[PDB]
Amino acid sequence: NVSVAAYLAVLLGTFIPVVFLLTLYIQSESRKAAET
Amino acid sequence: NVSVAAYLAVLLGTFIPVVFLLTLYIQSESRKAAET
Amino acid sequence: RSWLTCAHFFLGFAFYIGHLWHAGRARAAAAGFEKGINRENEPTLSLRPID
Amino acid sequence: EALGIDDTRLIVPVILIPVITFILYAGFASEQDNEDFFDTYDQRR
Amino acid sequence: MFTLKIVVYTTVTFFVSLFTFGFLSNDASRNPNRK
Amino acid sequence: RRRVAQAEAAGWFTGNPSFGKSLIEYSEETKKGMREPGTVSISAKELAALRAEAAKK
Amino acid sequence: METLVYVFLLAGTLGVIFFAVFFRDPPRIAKK
Amino acid sequence: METLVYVFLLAGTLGVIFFAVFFRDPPRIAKK
Amino acid sequence: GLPWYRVHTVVLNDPGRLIAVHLMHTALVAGWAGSMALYELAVFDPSDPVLNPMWR
Amino acid sequence: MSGPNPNKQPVELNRTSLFWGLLLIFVLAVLFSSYFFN
Amino acid sequence: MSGPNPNKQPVELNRTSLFWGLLLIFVLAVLFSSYFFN
Amino acid sequence: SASAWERFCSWITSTDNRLYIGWFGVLMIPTLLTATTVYIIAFVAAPPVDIDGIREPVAGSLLYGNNIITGAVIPSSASIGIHFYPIWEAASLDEWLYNGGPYQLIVDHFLLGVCGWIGREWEFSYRLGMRPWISVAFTAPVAAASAVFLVYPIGQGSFSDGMPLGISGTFNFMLVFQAEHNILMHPFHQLGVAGVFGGSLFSAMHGSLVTSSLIRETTENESANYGYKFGQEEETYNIVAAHGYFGRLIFQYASFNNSRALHFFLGLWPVVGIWFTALGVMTMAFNLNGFNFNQSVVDSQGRVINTWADILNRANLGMEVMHERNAHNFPLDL
Amino acid sequence: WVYWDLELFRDPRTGNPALDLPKIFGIHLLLSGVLCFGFGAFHVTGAWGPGIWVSD
Amino acid sequence: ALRTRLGELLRPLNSEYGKVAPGWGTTPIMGFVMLLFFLFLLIILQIYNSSLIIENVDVDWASLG
Ligand code: CLA
Ligand code: CLA
Ligand SMILES: CCCCCCCCCCCCCCCC(=O)OC[C@H](CO[C@@H]1O[C@H](CS(=O)(=O)O)[C@@H](O)[C@H](O)[C@H]1O)OC(=O)CCCCCCCCCCCCCCC
Ligand SMILES: CCCCCCCCCCCCCCCC(=O)OC[C@H](CO[C@@H]1O[C@H](CS(=O)(=O)O)[C@@H](O)[C@H](O)[C@H]1O)OC(=O)CCCCCCCCCCCCCCC
Ligand SMILES: CCCCCCCCCCCCCCCC(=O)OC[C@H](COP(=O)(O)OC[C@@H](O)CO)OC(=O)CCCCCCCCCCCCCCC
Ligand SMILES: CC1=CCCC(C)(C)[C@H]1/C=C/C(C)=C/C=C/C(C)=C/C=C/C=C(C)/C=C/C=C(C)/C=C/C1=C(C)CCCC1(C)C
Ligand code: OEX
Ligand SMILES: [Cl-]
Prior knowledge:
- The PDB classes it as photosynthesis.
- Keywords: Photosystem II, photosynthesis.
- Structure of PSII-ACPII supercomplex from cryptophyte algae.
- Chains A, B: Photosystem II reaction center M.
- The structure is cut from a larger assembly and holds 14 protein chains of 10 kinds.
- By secondary structure, chain D is an all-alpha fold.
- Chain D is built from 1 helix and no strands.
- By secondary structure, chain J is mainly α.
- Chains F and J meet through helix 2 of F and loops of J.
- One ligand SQD sits between chains B (3-5, 8) and H (1, 4-5, 8).
- The site of CA-MN4-O5 cluster (OEX) has 6 residues of chain L, from helix 6.
């Protein structure tokens, strides 16, 4: 039916760049908040 | 043999708290860097 | 044989422990810091930080 | 079998390397004072 | 197997020689209370 | 006071100004004074020029 | 194929140990 | 079981849209 | 700053945001109930209630 | 020497960029999930 | 009103805590991977 | 100005290295790195080992169907015994892998490395001008590792009886040891259990007493750990307050007034406990087993009334008749 | 990364961090020529090396 | 800027940043070499394209024998 280990591909390829963007945004927001 | 979808369990349960800790550390370091 | 072997293995290990204790204390008493670190001149405080 | 040596070629490094280390150590020791002291250890280096 | 044996013998002799002639090199003087 | 000396000269107090301080604690300083001991304030252009003159010829 | 996951986890743990040893926060005395 | 993954991805996209609409950065004029 | 294990104590003296986080937790629990029911309905076989009931 | 590198620069990501990146990644996952699975 | 909440506090995580958390999560994964897989 | 050997000795014994090497480290670093390398590669990919010598190999590596829990570096063959089995004493490398030579390599290098670690702890205690008895404390886990890796094989005459370098192998070692020596009834193992339980009790007690009486030096919006500054002169917690709390908890001289005596007790209890349990394993290597209270209660006629020791004996018999299948051709296990 | 401020990387004339890219290219081209000549003269030809895969 | 043995060894190899030859320098001979390289690439491209057939040069799998 549906090939396995594609769940890993879809979920990791969704998570890792999302993780990267969330980390960047939180880092930038905290740097702005500390600038004040 | 080895049950599938346990790869998802192991890898996501490894990544997500690691992601949380890395985000916390980077956020704290950038707040310290903008405090200066 | 079991009694002799076990007793003398016990005593050999115990006297290795004694050797380590007394060799360490002999070195520390010869160098002169067997009673503790001198507060006025602490050797670590005069070293560069390691990291 | 002394020191586990079954081939005579094994004796060459086992004897040779300590000789070179002793040569370096002997240079170090010839740099020293080498007279008797009355103390628990020698503070001269 | 002999080449590996002689390499291992050389390495063990080298490190044991360093150990032996390092502790002979006035190791008790190498303390912060010297001089 | 004799132990903050002989340690400041040895290299302590410099390098990691925010080591044993919390986020709020380190934010309270670096805004009302209390610079890192053993360090001075210098502009980036002046520091770059000094590093250029140090490596001259 | 789970052997790869085991090796990855062990290597990640060893890398964490390596970074905790050599890239640690340098201890300094504060001017309190 | 991939239907669950499809639904999760679609719902995540819709949640991103929701947060981009209602939790956006409020536009303000600067004092330049 | 606050440690990672004390991040939720900011709503300790803020009743409105305490109600907000309680509402968020309630929404998460209700959503889990709904999604769990949907998944169980997706994987349930009602053909034989005698030898394959819901607890099997 | 080992200390202040003059080339150190801060990194920013405003909320608009965060939302664009989230939308891009989620839409790419939606698009390519059907092909990874089959 | 909608604005500065007085209860806003910063959140910190020093490098020691980061390394402890990484070690904890990786060791837990090492421990429980054998049981999740079987 | 100095000789090359003097500069080499100054670098080896330098306190400016990130990790102190020292002369004991000269022996320690290569041995520990060799053991670590062989252990990693043999845990990942090593062929099964005929541990019992009966041509029935046991798989221990990850590539041969093991997880982290069941994986182990199998002890050497019973045909080898405690004969010295390096790589060059085997006809081929695969013969060395079949007979468990990696176990001997790892064990020998690891024991040399931990002896070097003891010596290196002494050495960097000496270079810093501190008292050198942390190595005496570290001798206890080294004693236990030696007892389970070298002494027990020496007593039983085979490196196959040493503790396997794994987790399930460790459990198998414990079960066979209980079956053949009844270690639970051995008073030295009971002293070791008291040592570890008391060490946990005293670690928790000291930690709770120090954390309970911390001197207020922080605000409500930060961790209490920042009230202590690294290198401060004053004490960070009220020793008198903790002493008073613990005196009123049990009785007024159940506490240690002296912090130095308290910390000596902290370092003394589990070190002595582990010393005693390691020596107990060393003595049971030569078959000086634990207490035997089997059939100690009889009635007026003489019928055996069982005790808890007899149920323990039944469990030990269950483990005894099942361990090392097809390796026993004789009734007794001498 | 730790030891970034090597004196080799700074221009003796100006002091700013600079790279003499034409001469670096000369050095790298000479190294690549030596490597290519060695590969083709010893590895491929079998003078000192295994050779390459040749099929029918 | 710390000074090392290897750094002092390689210092003359990175010491002439911005040093140029005045005028056009070696540009004409560079263009001649580029023209030769263009002709060579054209020749081998047309050989691989079988637009240029040379004696004893059979661009074919069968030439392996
Ligand atoms: C870029 C050109 C190139 C390439 C890709 C190869 C590729 C190859 N050659 Mg080859 N060769 C070349 C040029 C090249 N050669 C030249 C110019 C010569 C003439 C000198 C040769 C002569 C030659 C011989 C004689 C042989 C080969 C062989 C091989 C094969 C195995 C070697 C290998 O994989 O090494 C991979 C190497 C690495 C990945 C490097 C890692 C090394 C680590 C870092 C070791 C570290 C040690 C180092 C000293 C640092 C220690 C200190 C530190 C801890 C601080 C491989 C197909 C062998 C063969 O036939 O294979 C079947 C063989 O016998 N070659
Ligand atoms: C590995 C080969 C190689 C490389 C990379 C270089 C690189 C360089 N040489 Mg050089 N050189 C080489 C070999 C090489 N050399 C050889 C073998 C000789 C003979 C000894 C020379 C002789 C030489 C001289 C005499 C000079 C250089 C110079 C230069 C520099 C400037 C080049 C320039 O202006 O580009 C000009 C070209 C471009 C900017 C762009 C070209 C883009 C092409 C034309 C596009 C083509 C695309 C098109 C689709 C192709 C279709 C055709 C195809 C289908 C057939 C540069 C660092 C000059 C310099 O600075 O000296 C230090 C100089 O004066 N070289
Ligand atoms: C969206 C809301 C989420 C929270 C709501 C909670 C309730 C909803 C239930 C969620 C169900 C998730 C687990 C699915 C069940 C399962 O795994 O076993 C069923 C199968 C068993 O294998 C199968 O096995 C079969 C043969 S056998 O059984 O192995 O013998 C064979 O067909 C094949 O191998 C394989 O298909 O597992 C799978 O193969 C599918 C992989 C799991 C599906 C991915 C989950 C996607 C959502 C995760 C989101 C990440 C979280 C991030 C934080 C927001
Ligand atoms: C059958 C009998 C013959 C065999 C038995 C021999 C008895 C052995 C003990 C006697 C010898 C040791 C004397 C005390 C040790 C010492 O260093 O004194 C210094 C202090 C004593 O009091 C401190 O003494 C100090 C004064 S002074 O300098 O020591 O004079 C004082 O300043 C401080 O306040 C005070 O706390 O050390 C201590 O506080 C530790 C006291 C307990 C240690 C010995 C008791 C045994 C505990 C169990 C052993 C571990 C078993 C674990 C197994 C699970
Ligand atoms: C959907 C949501 C899914 C996300 C949920 C999960 C994410 C949360 C996971 C985070 C847990 C992190 C805890 C670590 C965070 C961490 O440790 O920080 C250390 C931290 C430091 O304390 P302080 O108060 O000094 O903190 C300073 C602050 O800056 C830290 O925020 O202390 C604690 O947090 C106390 C807990 C001790 C915990 C000890 C852990 C060590 C365990 C053993 C490690 C393995 C041993 C191996 C050998 C056997
Ligand atoms: C792995 C693990 C860790 C250790 C414990 C334990 C072993 C038990 C195990 C438990 C893990 C936990 C706590 C899992 C939690 C799962 C949860 C909370 C799942 C809930 C998901 C919520 C969902 C879908 C909500 C869906 C709601 C939607 C679309 C609403 C959309 C709408 C809104 C937003 C506006 C109005 C219109 C409409 C359409 C109603
Ligand atoms: O392997 Mn281990 O423990 Ca020396 O005895 Mn016989 O074998 Mn088996 O039984 Mn008892
Ligand atoms: Cl038998």
